[PDB]
Structure 1
Amino acid sequence: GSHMPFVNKQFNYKDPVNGVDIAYIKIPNAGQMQPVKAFKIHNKIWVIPERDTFTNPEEGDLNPPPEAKQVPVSYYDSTYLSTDNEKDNYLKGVTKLFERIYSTDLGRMLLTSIVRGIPFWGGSTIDTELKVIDTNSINVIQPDGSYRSEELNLVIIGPSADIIQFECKSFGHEVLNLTRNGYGSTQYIRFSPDFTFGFEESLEVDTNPLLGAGKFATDPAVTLAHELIHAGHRLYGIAINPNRVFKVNTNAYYEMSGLEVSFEELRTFGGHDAKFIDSLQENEFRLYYYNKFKDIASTLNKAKSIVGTTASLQYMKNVFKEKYLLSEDTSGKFSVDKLKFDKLYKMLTEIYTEDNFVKFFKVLNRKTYLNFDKAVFKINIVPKVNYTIYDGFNLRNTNLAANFNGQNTEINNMNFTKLKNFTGLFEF
């Protein structure tokens, strides 16, 4: 469903800020930062082609740590994203990759949820008062120079010191049950079109730490989509806590090292990885989020009070009605229909998954979340001659159309530059 494109504008980084879709802006609870030039590429969704020194206090220096410090699966370049055509490339890449996602029926579905996925207005200490949470906002510099507060859902931002960072260390005392309480909060995705990962086409090698160089290339659109499915659990508040984890007995090598994997990661991947979330336990999650919804439904029915935007009590009321699929009765009251809850739930946690996105994209991809990366490559998907919205790297009317030759790296070698090999380097 890309008949009308997701980004309707041709964007280049150098364009004069208008204070609307191209504006210096500031993110919440950084009062420090110099305003940053950002771009609104679609309603509720913004893009910040700078590397992220902001959101988290801990990083904020892109300098590489000592080499005795660094783990093999880390990669550091302090100069990346520093120039203009670079940030120009970034906008162009991120844009395409959305359009790609958006031309699949799955992508169209998903993205619609993400737009509709507005963070609940929970800010008030007063239970009968409707209050938007201000962490859910950005602050944008209007053409006059005055600040305007603007509510959003998603931000695509450049990386941090570690470009390939495969896990977050970031989040701890941040008060965000917003992701597990059904509220949702505005998600911040760190992402680079300009890099992607090597992997092996055979299961026995791919799940082996000691074997292979990464013959094939992950399609960044599969990568972006993945964070977007994460983002969707975390906009609706149905995300699973990171400390729920699977101690891995499915792999000798993982198990040897006591590596654990968060249920949220297994769910996000989907496929045959989802049975490793215990059906027993999963129903517990279900009932929880189903009850979490009954709380949002209640809170909605109590509230006679708002904090004025232009918006009335009943306009926003219907916005969250739509978001959670609520059932109103003759008396004007909201409830949670147990059918539509499971509808919504099945959709986010099951229908939208990395596995299925691989189905739509007609691409080669890692068969399981539990596997061992081989390489990281530098890429450029901006030239149409490298990469397209419809065919990705495997380009129709070329020798790369068939047998996944576009992702084939010894064939398309023109299109990739290896940076690191992770093989053998793993902690074993």
Structure 2
Amino acid sequence: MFVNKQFNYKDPVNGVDIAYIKIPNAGQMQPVKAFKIHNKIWVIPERDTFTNPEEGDLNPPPEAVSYYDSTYLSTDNEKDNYLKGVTKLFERIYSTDLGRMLLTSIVRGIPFWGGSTIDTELKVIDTNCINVIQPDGSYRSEELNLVIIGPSADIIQFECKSFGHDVLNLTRNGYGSTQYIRFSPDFTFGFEESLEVDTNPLLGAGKFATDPAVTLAHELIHAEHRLYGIAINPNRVFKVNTNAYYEGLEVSFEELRTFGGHDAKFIDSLQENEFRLYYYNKFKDVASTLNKAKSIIGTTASLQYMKNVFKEKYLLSEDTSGKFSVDKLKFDKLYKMLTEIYTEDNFVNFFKVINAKTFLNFDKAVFRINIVPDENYTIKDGFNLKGANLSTNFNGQNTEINSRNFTRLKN
């Protein structure tokens, strides 16, 4: 039971799990009503005009596969439906053995306390917190790992972003940072079934719809990489040979890794090893820092407690002297888990749903949906409901047969 509380958008703020909050480096934004659905995880049912200054408007630009609608997610009823949809997709993910593991890793992935210039001092990094406004008007600083928020101007432009430090590369130095996922459970993408020799022939018809749970899981996978600070520099790309009418189509390693399956292998053995050794060295640096720590600032939590928190996050070894170190095989297990086990491909297999076979199989259309009603979608079966006739040949994802659950919007 990932979310052990029924949340309704209109419930009164209580300063604990329902509250008006303020995001870091947000200039001066007005507070926004947010909900804490699980330890370290909040949801803001608002269009994202806070994380980025240059994107503080929901106005359509000169366009370029995108979708715009400045009125989307503007009403309380919409925010309530949004909140319910996100919550439901989390339960769907959490209900699988793979999803339970990923979310556990995410919750244990507290961004590192590496904000001090004094090496014998442990200190938090402010951008890894939110200010929770209380009933009396005061604000409480609270640390969090994950925030799910609505999309910015481009409604279907989902992504995992974070604030970053002046000098440190939090998502790539092993530290990690609070992750903000722009996402919407109100839309999903359509993809065409690649007719292959050995693929089920009884497949309903034309377009199939992506299970929004796979989409969220995909983003949660990026978030896990970023929380453990082992994300691959977005600069590292593979030049995919698409056409002969193209002397080039870049796809980043971070993406190929996240999608997993056959595409992940485009990251050769030399590069894999390179990344693994690099982060292993980075975890060792975290160990040293913890060892040289004698005091903790922003006091409340004890020093040994915070050290334990990170000993647990990085699966560090501790001897009788109380000194931490990185165990090669524990590191390998953790690293493998975060990069090879948690993948969109493995989720598609656990969920047993149809999905694009590779990024190469680019989606075609954008559909409007509503997974909240059980008559439409359930935690256990997605769109492919049991008693229904939709539980056969993925009829539930067939946007022709299950025409009532999908409303074409673009392309």
TM-score w.r.t. length of structure 2? 0.95
Q: Is the 8 A contact 1:214 1:374 kept in 2?
A: no
Q: 1:13 to 1:169 in 2, by over 3 A?
A: closer
Alpha-carbon distance, 1:317 to partner: 0.6
Structure 2 counterpart SS, 1:168: strand
Give, in whole Å, the separation in 2 of the partners of 1:82 and 1:267.
35
Deviations 1:288-336, CA, capped at 9 Å, x for gaps: 0000001000001011011143211111111100100111112211111
Classify the secondary structure of the residue corresponding to 2:390: coil
Give the match for residue 251 of structure 2.
261
Offset at residue 371 of structure 1 (A): 2.4
Asked if 2 retains the 8 angstrom alpha-carbon contact of 1:7 and 1:99, the reply is yes
Contact 1:215 1:409 in 2 (8 A): yes
Of 164, 186, 196, 1:194 maps to 186
Runs of at least 5 residues in structure 1 that lack an aligned partner in the other structure: 1-5, 422-428
1:346 CA drift (Å): 0.3
Aligned to 1:247: 239
Per-residue deviation at 1:30?
Answer: 1.4
- Whether the 8 Å CA contact 1:207–1:370 is kept in 2: the answer is no
Deviating more after overlay: 273-282 vs 58-67 = 58-67
Check 1:164–1:296 CA distance in 2 against 1; reply closer, same or farther (3 A cut). Answer: same
Q: 1:230 is matched with which residue: 203, 222, 225?
A: 222
* 1:78-116 superposed Cα distances (whole Å, 9 cap, x missing partner): 000000110000000000000000000000000000000
Q: How does the TM-score come out when normalised to structure 1?
A: 0.91
Cα distance change of structure 1 residues 171 and 241 upon mapping to structure 2, 3 Å threshold:
farther
Specify whether residues 417 and 244 from structure 1 end up closer, same or farther in structure 2 by C-alpha distance, changes over 3 A only. Answer: same
Distance 1:219 1:396 in 2: 16
Seen in structure 2, the aligned counterparts of structure 1 residues 373 and 66 have a Cα distance that, compared at 3 Å, is: same
User: In structure 2, do the counterparts of structure 1 residues 19 and 193 end up closer, same or farther at CA, with 3 Å as the change threshold?
Assistant: same
SS in 2 for 1:291: helix
Once the two structures are TM-superposed, the CA of residue 382 in structure 1 deviates from its matched residue by 0.5
Deviation at 1:166, TM superposition (A): 6.2
Q: How many residues align?
A: 410
Q: 1:176 to 1:52 in 2, by over 3 A?
A: farther
For residue 148 of structure 1, give the secondary structure of its aligned residue in structure 2. strand
Answer yes or no: is the 8 Å Cα contact 2:159–2:183 preserved in 1: no
3-state SS in 1 of match to 2:118:
coil
Residues 252, 418 of structure 1: alpha-carbon distance in 2 compared, 3 angstrom cutoff: farther
Change in CA separation of 1:228 and 1:167 when aligned onto 2, cut-off 3 Å: closer
What is aligned with 1:106? 98
SS of 2:397's equivalent in the other structure is coil
Write the deviation string for residues 33-87 of structure 1: whole angstroms up to 9, x where unpaired. Answer: 000000000000000000000010111111112358xxxx111010000001100
Greater Cα shift, 214-223 or 104-113: 214-223
CA distance in structure 1 between the aligned counterparts of 2:201 and 2:168, rounded to whole angstroms: 35
Contact 1:176 / 1:185 at 8 angstroms: preserved in 2?
no
**DSSP 3-state at the match of 2:153:** coil
Contact 2:34 2:45 in 1 (8 A): yes
CA distance in 2, matches of 1:47, 1:80: 17
1:136 aligns with 2:136: no
Provide the secondary structure at the position in 2 that maps to 1:246. Answer: strand
Could you tell me the percent identity over the aligned residues? Answer: 95
1:314 is paired with a residue whose SS is helix
Change (3 A) 1:333 1:36: same
Q: CA deviation at 1:251?
A: 6.0
Check conservation: 1:30, 1:55, Cα contact below 8 A.
yes
Q: Distance in 2 between matches of 1:263 and 1:384?
A: 37
- The 3-state SS of whatever aligns with 1:177 is coil
* Deviation by residue 1:117-163 (Cα, 9 ceiling, x = unmatched): 00000111101101011100000101111011000000000010001
> How has the CA–CA distance of structure 1 residues 290 and 148 changed in structure 2, closer, same or farther, with 3 Å as cutoff?
same
Q: Does the aligned pair in 2 maintain the 1:157–1:189 contact within 8 Å? A: yes
Task: Mark the CA change 1:208 to 1:234 in structure 2 (over 3 Å): closer, same or farther.
Answer: farther
How far did 1:204 drift? Answer: 7.3
User: 1:249 offset after TM fit, Å?
Assistant: 2.3
Q: What is the aligned-residue RMSD (CA, Å)?
A: 3.1
Distance change in 2, residues 1:322/1:28 (3 Å): same
Unaligned runs of 5+ in 2: none
